[PDB]
Structure formats: C-alpha cells, structure tokens
Amino acid sequence: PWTATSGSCKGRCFELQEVGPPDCRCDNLCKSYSSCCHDFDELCLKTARGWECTKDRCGEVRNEENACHCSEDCLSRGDCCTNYQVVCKGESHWVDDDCEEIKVPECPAGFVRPPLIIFSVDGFRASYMKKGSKVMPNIEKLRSCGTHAPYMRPVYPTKTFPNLYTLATGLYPESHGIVGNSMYDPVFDASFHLRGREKFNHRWWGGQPLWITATKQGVRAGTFFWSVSIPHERRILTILQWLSLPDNERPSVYAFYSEQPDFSGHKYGPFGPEMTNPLREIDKTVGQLMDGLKQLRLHRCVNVIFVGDHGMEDVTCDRTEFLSNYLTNVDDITLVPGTLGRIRAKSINNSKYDPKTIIAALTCKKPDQHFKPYMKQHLPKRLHYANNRRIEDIHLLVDRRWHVARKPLDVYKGKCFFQGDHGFDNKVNSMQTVFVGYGPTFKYRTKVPPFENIELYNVMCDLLGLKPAPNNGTHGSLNHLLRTNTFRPTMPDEVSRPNYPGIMYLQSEFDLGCTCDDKKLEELNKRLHTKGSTKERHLLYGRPAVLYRTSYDILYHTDFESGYSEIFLMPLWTSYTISKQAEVSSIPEHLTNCVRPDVRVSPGFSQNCLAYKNDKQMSYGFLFPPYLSSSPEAKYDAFLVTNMVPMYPAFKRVWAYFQRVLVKKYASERNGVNVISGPIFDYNYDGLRDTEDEIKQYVEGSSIPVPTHYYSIITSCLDFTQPADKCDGPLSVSSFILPHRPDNDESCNSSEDESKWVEELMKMHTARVRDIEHLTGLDFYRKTSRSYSEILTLKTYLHTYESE
Numbered sequence: 178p179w180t181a182t183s184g185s186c187k188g189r190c191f192e193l194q195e196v197g198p199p200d201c202r203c204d205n206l207c208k209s210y211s212s213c214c215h216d217f218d219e220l221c222l223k224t225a226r227g228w229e230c231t232k233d234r235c236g237e238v239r240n241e242e243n244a245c246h247c248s249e250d251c252l253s254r255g256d257c258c259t260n261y262q263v264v265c266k267g268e269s270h271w272v273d274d275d276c277e278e279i280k281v282p283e284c285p286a287g288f289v290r291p292p293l294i295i296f297s298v299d300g301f302r303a304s305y306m307k308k309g310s311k312v313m314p315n316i317e318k319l320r321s322c323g324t325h326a327p328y329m330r331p332v333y334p335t336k337t338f339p340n341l342y343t344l345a346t347g348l349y350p351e352s353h354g355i356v357g358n359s360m361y362d363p364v365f366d367a368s369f370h371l372r373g374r375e376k377f378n379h380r381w382w383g384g385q386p387l388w389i390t391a392t393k394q395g396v397r398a399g400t401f402f403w404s405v406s407i408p409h410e411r412r413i414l415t416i417l418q419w420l421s422l423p424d425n426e427r428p429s430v431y432a433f434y435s436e437q438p439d440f441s442g443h444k445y446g447p448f449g450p451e452m453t454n455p456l457r458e459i460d461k462t463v464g465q466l467m468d469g470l471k472q473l474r475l476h477r478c479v480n481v482i483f484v485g486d487h488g489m490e491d492v493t494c495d496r497t498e499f500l501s502n503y504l505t506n507v508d509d510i511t512l513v514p515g516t517l518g519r520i521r522a523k524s525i526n527n528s529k530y531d532p533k534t535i536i537a538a539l540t541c542k543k544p545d546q547h548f549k550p551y552m553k554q555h556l557p558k559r560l561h562y563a564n565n566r567r568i569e570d571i572h573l574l575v576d577r578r579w580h581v582a583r584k585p586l587d588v589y590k591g592k593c594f595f596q597g598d599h600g601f602d603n604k605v606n607s608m609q610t611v612f613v614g615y616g617p618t619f620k621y622r623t624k625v626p627p628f629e630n631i632e633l634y635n636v637m638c639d640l641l642g643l644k645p646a647p648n649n650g651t652h653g654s655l656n657h658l659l660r661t662n663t664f665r666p667t668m669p670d671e672v673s674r675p676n677y678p679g680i681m682y683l684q685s686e687f688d689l690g691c692t693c694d695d696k697k698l699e700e701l702n703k704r705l706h707t708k709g710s711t712k713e714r715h716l717l718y719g720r721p722a723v724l725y726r727t728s729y730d731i732l733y734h735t736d737f738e739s740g741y742s743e744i745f746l747m748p749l750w751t752s753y754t755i756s757k758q759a760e761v762s763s764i765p766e767h768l769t770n771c772v773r774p775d776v777r778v779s780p781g782f783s784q785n786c787l788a789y790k791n792d793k794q795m796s797y798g799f800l801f802p803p804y805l806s807s808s809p810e811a812k813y814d815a816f817l818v819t820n821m822v823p824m825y826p827a828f829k830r831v832w833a834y835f836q837r838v839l840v841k842k843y844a845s846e847r848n849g850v851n852v853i854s855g856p857i858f859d860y861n862y863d864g865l866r867d868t869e870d871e872i873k874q875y876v877e878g879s880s881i882p883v884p885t886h887y888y889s890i891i892t893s894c895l896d897f898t899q900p901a902d903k904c905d906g907p908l909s910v911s912s913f914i915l916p917h918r919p920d921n922d923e924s925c926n927s928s929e930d931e932s933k934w935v936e937e938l939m940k941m942h943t944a945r946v947r948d949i950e951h952l953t954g955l956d957f958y959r960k961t962s963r964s965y966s967e968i969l970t971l972k973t974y975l976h977t978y979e980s981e
C-alpha cells in the first residue's frame with residue numbers, strides 16, 4: 178500500500194490513534210509497517226546523551242535534542258530521565274526503599290481508577306525467579322512484597338504468539354485462532370509467519386482482546402504491540418509520558434513487552450553463562466519503570482503485572498527425529514516442524530494421500546522414539562487443541578529436549594547455532610513461566626498456588642472495572658489474588674430436576690437377552706439402602722447439578738448412587754466412597770456374565786444384552802466396580818443393567834486395572850477417596866457436551882450411544898490425617914478423561930502387564946474438574962462447607978505428575 182512519507186511527526190510522537198489511508202504514521206507500530214513519516218527518527222527516537230541524568234546535567238537549560246531531560250521543568254513536562262530525582266534531588270531508587278503495605282490506592286488528583294501496567298517478558302522460565310535472584314533486585318522486590326505464584330502454566334503450544342494473545346483474551350488458541358507461530362488457513366490459502374506482513378491482517382485474530390474490551394466500555398488503552406527496533410528505554414519513557422497526559426486523554430491500561438530473555442535463550446540455552454546479562458538488563462528496565470512511577474508519585478497507585486509467556490528448554494540439532502526415517506512417501510506431505518509437528522497433504526488434488534497409513538507408519542516404530550503421532554481429536558483433552566481448521570488432523574507431540582523435521586537437509590542447510598527452544602506440552606516443568614502482581618488491588622506479601630494463564634484476562638478486567646467478554650477463564654477462581662474483589666461468583670441454576678423412581682416393573686416385563694445366576698429383618702435394610710439411607714456416605718459434596726434440559730433418574734444403592742439418563746440409556750454420573758480400610762474382591766465365577774434388569778427403570782429406557790452379543794467390536798464394563806462391593810449381597814447391585822456402559826475390549830484392559838488396583842491404592846495413599854465416574858460424548862471435538870443428534874456411533878442395532886471418553890473425579894481431604902468421609906477443611910482432587918479407543922496404539926508398552934503402562938496413560942490424560950464440566954454439562958461440589966471462590970480454584974486444579 179502506498180504511503181506519502183511526505184507528512185511530519187511534529188507534535189505526534191507515539192500518538193495513540195492510528196492513522197491511514199496513504200498518510201504517514203507516528204505511532205509505535207509505524208516501523209513494522211514501514212510507514213513512519215520521514216522525520217520519525219529525528220523527532221521521536223532521540224538518543225542524545227543516553228538515558229541517565231548525571232550530576233553535571235542537573236538543572237541544565239532544556240535542550241530538546243536530548244533523549245530525556247534533567248532540567249528543572251522536566252517533571253511538569255513529564256519527560257525526565259527515570260533517575261532524575263535520584264541524581265538531582267537526593268531521592269532514593271525504588272528498589273532501596275523498604276516494602277510498605279499498600280492498603281489503599283494513593284493516586285494524584287484527577288485519577289479515576291488505579292492504572293494497570295502489564296510488563297510481559299518473553300521466554301522467562303519459572304525457575305529464573307530463584308536461580309537468577311542475586312542479579313534481579315527489582316523483580317525480587319516486586320515478587321516478595323506483592324502477590325506471586327511459584328509458576329504459571331502457559332497454553333499449548335508453548336509458543337510466543339499463541340500465549341501472548343491468550344493473556345489478552347482469556348481464550349484457548351483453538352478459539353482465538355492463533356494456534357502456532359506459523360499457520361496455514363485452508364479457507365485463506367494463506368500462511369501466517371512470525372516475520373512478514375500477513376500476520377498484520379486482522380482476519381487471523383479472533384476473540385476480544387483486553388484493549389478492545391476496555392475501549393468498548395469507556396476505559397482508554399495504550400498500544401500493547403511494540404516494533405522490535407524501538408529500544409526498551411524508549412518504550413518505558415513513552416509509557417511514563419502517556420501517564421502525564423490530561424485526565425480526559427490518559428489511558429488506564431498499558432503494556433510493555435521484552436524480547437528477552439527468549440532471544441538469548443535460543444542461542445545459549447536456558448542456563449548458559451551468557452544468560453546472566455539478559456536477566457540483569459530486564460531487572461534494570463523494571464528499575465527504570467518503578468523509579469519513573471515514583472517520580473510521578475504513582476508507585477503506590479498503579480497495579481503492575483510481571484508476567485511471562487512460556488519458559489525455555491535445552492534443545493540442540495543432533496536431537497532431531499527425521500520423518501524421512503519412517504515414511505517412504507515423504508514428499509507427499511507438508512510438515513510444520515520443531516517442538517511440535519503438524520502434518521497435512523502436499524496437494525489438495527492428491528486422492529491417494531492416506532492419514533491412516535501416515536499415522537501407522539509413525540506409531541511405535543523405534544524403541545525410544547522421541548515423538549508420538551495423534552489424530553487431533555485423540556490428543557489429551559487438557560490441551561484443548563483441536564477445534565480449529567488451522568490445526569491439521571495429524572499432530573505430533575514431541576518429547577522435551579527434542580525436535581521433529583521432515584528430512585535432514587531441513588536442519589543442516591553443517592553447523593548448529595541453537596541451544597534452546599520451547600513449544601512442548603504445557604505440563605512440562607521447563608515450559609512454566611512467571612506471575613507477580615504488585616500494587617494496591619493485589620495482596621501484600623502473599624504466595625498463591627500455580628494457575629493457568631487463561632485465568633488472567635478476567636482478573637485484569639476486575640482490576641479495571643470491566644465486564645469480561647465470554648472466555649475460558651473461570652471467573653472467581655483467582656479472587657484469592659486480590660485485596661478488593663469486584664466479582665462475586667454464584668452457582669449456575671440446575672436446569673433439570675431428577676425423578677426418584679420406586680419399584681415399578683416386574684422381572685418378566687424385560688426382554689433384554691440378559692442372564693444372571695442370582696436366584697427377614699435383612700429385608701428392611703435392603704429397602705432403606707434403595708431409598709437413600711447410605712447416600713451421605715457415597716455422595717459427599719451434594720448431587721451434581723444438570724445444567725441442560727433432559728430426563729434422568731436418581732438411583733440409590735448400598736455402595737453407590739447414580740444419575741441415570743433415560744435419553745442416553747446410561748448414568749451421566751456414578752458416585753461412591755472407598756475408605757482406607759476397604760477390601761478388594763473378585764467377580765465370583767457364577768457372576769462373570771451376569772447382567773440384571775433394574776425394576777425401577779422401564780425396559781424401554783434400558784440397555785440390552787443382545788446388542789452387545791451381536792456387536793462383534795463392542796463389549797461392556799461397569800461404572801461402579803464389582804471388585805469394590807461391601808459384601809457378597811451388595812455385589813449384585815453392581816451388575817444392574819443401569820450400571821453398564823459400552824467398552825471396547827482394548828479399553829476394558831485399562832478400566833479394569835483402574836477399578837481393581839488403582840482406586841484401592843489411592844484410598845490407601847490418601848486416607849479414603851470419593852470417586853465420581855461417567856461417560857463423555859465429544860464427537861465434534863469442541864470440548865463441549867454433545868446433543869444426541871451429534872453422536873456418530875451406536876452399539877450395533879441399538880440406540881445405545883458409544884462414549885468418546887470416560888472420566889473420573891477423585892476427591893479426598895487435603896489434610897490426609899482426616900478420612901475422606903469426615904473432612905473438616907479444604908479438599909484435594911485429581912481427575913482424568915481417558916479416550917475410549919478400540920486399540921491401545923497410544924501406549925507402546927501395551928503388550929506388557931497393565932502394571933507397566935496403564936497408570937502412565939492415565940497421567941497423560943490428567944484433567945481439571947472444569948474440563949469435565951464443559952464436556953458433560955454437570956456442575957460438581959454443590960454442597961460443601963467451603964467458600965464458592967475456593968471451590969472454583971479447586972475445579973481449576975490440574976494434577977500434573979511433574980517432579981519439582
């Protein structure tokens with residue numbers, strides 16, 4: 178597009194409103210667009226005399242050619258060097274002052290609300306906070322006086338643009354559209370790349386970023402984007418100048434961005450000796466901002482967020498897996514390479530391209546293979562990485578410390594020159610990044626548990642008094658970060674009330690093709706259990722609330738309670754408690770193939786055994802495990818047709834090991850557990866519960882729908898000295914969402930005993946309770962003694978199984 182660079186930046190330097198059409202620009206992005214007016218450098222990027230006052234410059238006569246000023250008039254003009262008051266007025270640097278609690282905002286007249294400054298640092302690995310602490314005195318003061326987490330979990334892929342735009346929107350990359358640092362949209366036949374102009378087009382960038390949310394609601398916003406060649410000292414000086422604008426013109430939200438330490442980390446590795454200097458330099462920049470805020474009397478008024486996008490791992494050229502070592506047809510594909518792989522067909526006009534044969538040729542081919550292929554819908558649900566046409570059907574998850582590439586010549590175009598990289602699974606320790614919150618709205622000297630970057634947008638909205646756009650955070654889950662909370666969450670209303678059926682059908686009314694070998698005062702006890710006498714033991718936190726319109730029944734039993742769906746012909750949820758002392762037993766010989774009609778539920782709303790006999794692929798399992806029955810008589814309950822769910826034989830290997838061995842291990846380790854298990858249907862891989870008309874597979878000849886996944890939520894007392902069923906304080910939870918697959922190809926060791934691979938699979942598919950809520954339309958923990966904000970934090974917890 179033609180620019181008339183003929184105009185001037187006089188009185189326009191770093192203007193807030195971006196200009197067109199062929200007119201030249203003076204804003205902080207004009208350099209990226211190559212559209213700055215001819216005099217932008219002269220007027221706007223002054224450098225004379227550097228960035229610091231010195232004794233002899235004090236009270237100088239103003240010289241407008243200087244980078245910053247030491248003249249008497251500078252504070253009124255808003256353009257002193259950040260160390261002016263220290264050098265010329267005997268003041269102390271902010272870092273040398275004692276921490277003092279900020280109980281209330283202390284702001285100059287005309288400030289309507291405390292401003293928010295986001296200070297984002299690329300590649301700032303979480304352990305830098307401890308490991309680089311001797312050389313970062315300013316950052317360490319923010320961290321220990323403010324609110325901080327030991328680390329913050331980024332989104333997958335742990336690349337720069339997906340994570341910065343998640344910070345800004347509160348959305349998963351599948352929903353905001355920025356799904357990697359490089360992308361091809363098939364409906365655009367356009368690529369998006371780090372370097373280039375295509376990324377400037379707004380069509381890639383979905384959702385509603387914080388600056389738009391603010392502007393729509395009458396809060397003014399600084400530019401979050403920075404051109405790479407504007408130096409850091411000039412970015413800081415520009416933010417401080419904007420903060421001296423008149424009340425009607427002054428933004429309330431600002432962002433600073435640093436390319437370091439990422440830039441050096443790629444060259445030298447995360448802990449190369451060359452990394453000390455980039456850390457010192459970011460600390461100095463923090464020092465400049467805080468000294469400048471202190472001059473303008475805003476150091477006890479502004480809220481500051483020091484936040485990273487992802488970490489950095491050791492990665493070298495010789496740790497590259499090559500697709501040419503696996504596939505013959507290597508030139509029929511296009512690969513997006515590196516710390517993750519995405520594979521598509523080279524040519525739309527190629528009809529002999531087979532994803533199925535590509536996966537098979539990539540599956541368990543070499544003993545210590547350093548990647549694993551997945552159809553995108555089979556990736557761990559915790560990654561939320563599938564519901565976007567820019568994400569290719571075929572995906573490779575790459576081991577930490579490794580790369581994937583198509584052919585050797587792609588790498589050794591042969592010397593190396595890179596020692597660090599990122600992009601791996603977001604549960605990986607080296608990928609974690611940082612959060613510090615400092616200012617009047619944050620708590621004083623407070624440590625909070627680790628949390629996910631998707632939650633920050635809601636909190637930044639609360640900090641500015643904005644109503645957040647719809648997003649993937651759970652609003653209220655981070656209230657514990659804040660001294661004054663704008664947001665008080667309330668529980669969603671239950672939409673469907675359950676039926677409580679009694680005995681309504683005679684045995685001979687059922688014609689389900691099922692058989693079971695199952696033919697005083699003990700009689701009253703049986704009825705009590707069926708009516709809910711033990712329900713307080715097995716349903717510890719209330720029944721889950723059904724948040725959509727449906728028909729379902731509550732079923733009580735000695736050992737477990739369930740919510741049984743008349744529409745899906747199976748439980749939506751099944752809840753049971755296993756104490757530390759519980760005994761495991763076997764399924765007796767005469768009960769191996771036992772399935773029993775449930776006389777509370779009509780034949781018309783039941784599964785049938787004939788369908789499973791006819792369907793040669795599909796078998797069945799049970800939600801409450803018969804192995805954990807409390808007595809030989811209660812065990813008959815576990816064989817009810819209302820406790821049955823469809824399972825592939827290959828999946829029953831996983832499920833039976835979980836129910837027979839692991840549940841008991843967890844009860845032993847945690848001093849009792851309460852378990853809620855159920856089916857999930859997500860045939861369109863959008864992370865959301867399917868309606869019945871979205872189901873793509875049924876048990877042959879029937880209306881019994883086949884789940885895509887099975888979940889379990891496992892709860893106990895955070896103080897493990899108290900048993901799960903008598904717990905007075907906070908709770909502890911782990912959960913999973915296992916894919917319901919007809920093979921165990923995902924597990925390369927699946928020919929061995931389950932003791933060698935099953936728990937490993939489960940750990941990979943760890944989940945948050947909130948992930949399960951989205952996928953089921955249920956709302957858990959409705960009746961506890963805990964506060965709702967606390968329950969929201971619990972529902973967002975992810976058990977990661979990483980070491981320390």
Ligand SMILES: *[C@@H]1O[C@H](CO)[C@@H](O[C@@H]2O[C@H](CO)[C@@H](O[C@@H]3O[C@H](CO[C@H]4O[C@H](CO[C@H]5O[C@H](CO)[C@@H](O)[C@H](O)[C@@H]5O)[C@@H](O)[C@H](O[C@H]5O[C@H](CO)[C@@H](O)[C@H](O)[C@@H]5O[C@H]5O[C@H](CO)[C@@H](O)[C@H](O)[C@@H]5O)[C@@H]4O)[C@@H](O)[C@H](O[C@H]4O[C@H](CO)[C@@H](O)[C@H](O)[C@@H]4O[C@H]4O[C@H](CO)[C@@H](O)[C@H](O)[C@@H]4O)[C@@H]3O)[C@H](O)[C@H]2NC(C)=O)[C@H](O)[C@H]1NC(C)=O
Nearest residue numbers: 351352353354383384385564565566646647648649864951
């Ligand atoms: C994480 O959080 C997010 C955010 O809350 C959740 O994602 C939301 O989920 C909703 C349900 O799936 C979905 O609702 C859809 O949306 C349809 C309209 O969508 C467009 O308009 C949106 C609103 O924009 C305005 O407001 C926002 C403020 O937030 C501003 O930013 C805007 O400027 C507007 O003022 C807009 O956000 C949305 O953005 C997507 O599409 C853009 C352009 O393509 C992209 O740039 C952007 O990145 C978004 O892309 C994502 O989302 C799309 C799906 O929308 C997806 O394909 C991509 O892969 C990507 O993931 C749009 O521009 C609306 O028409 C839908 O209604 C239809 O379906 C239902 C039944 O299913 C009916 O109720 C309805 O009558 C209608 O049926 C008809 O259409 C059917 C399908 O076409 C058809 O088959 C049928 O026959 C009928 O004719 C529905 O409401 C939201 O759009 C979505 N939002 C976002 C931002 O992603 C997400 O679910 C959460 N994740 C988890 C795991 O919880």
Ligand SMILES: CC(=O)N1CCC(c2ccc3ncn(CC(=O)N(C)Cc4ccc(Cl)c(OC(F)(F)F)c4)c(=O)c3c2)CC1
Nearest residue numbers: 209295297341342344345376377382401402403404432434
């Ligand atoms: C969508 C839109 O309005 N567009 C589309 C994109 C356009 C555009 C035009 C020129 C550009 N020049 C340089 N850079 C690099 C940069 O600014 N980085 C790495 C910092 C950064 C990037 C993202 C977020 Cl979210 C962020 O904020 C933060 F840090 F807070 F997350 C901070 C750009 O990204 C860039 C983008 C502007 C208009």
Ligand SMILES: [Ca+2]
Nearest residue numbers: 859865866867
């Ligand atoms: Ca779905």
Ligand SMILES: [Cl-]
Nearest residue numbers: 336357358359
């Ligand atoms: Cl990428």
Ligand SMILES: [K+]
Nearest residue numbers: 789792795796
């Ligand atoms: K079968």
Ligand code: NA
Nearest residue numbers: 921922924927
């Ligand atoms: Na296998």
Ligand SMILES: [Zn+2]
Nearest residue numbers: 300337439443
């Ligand atoms: Zn990087």
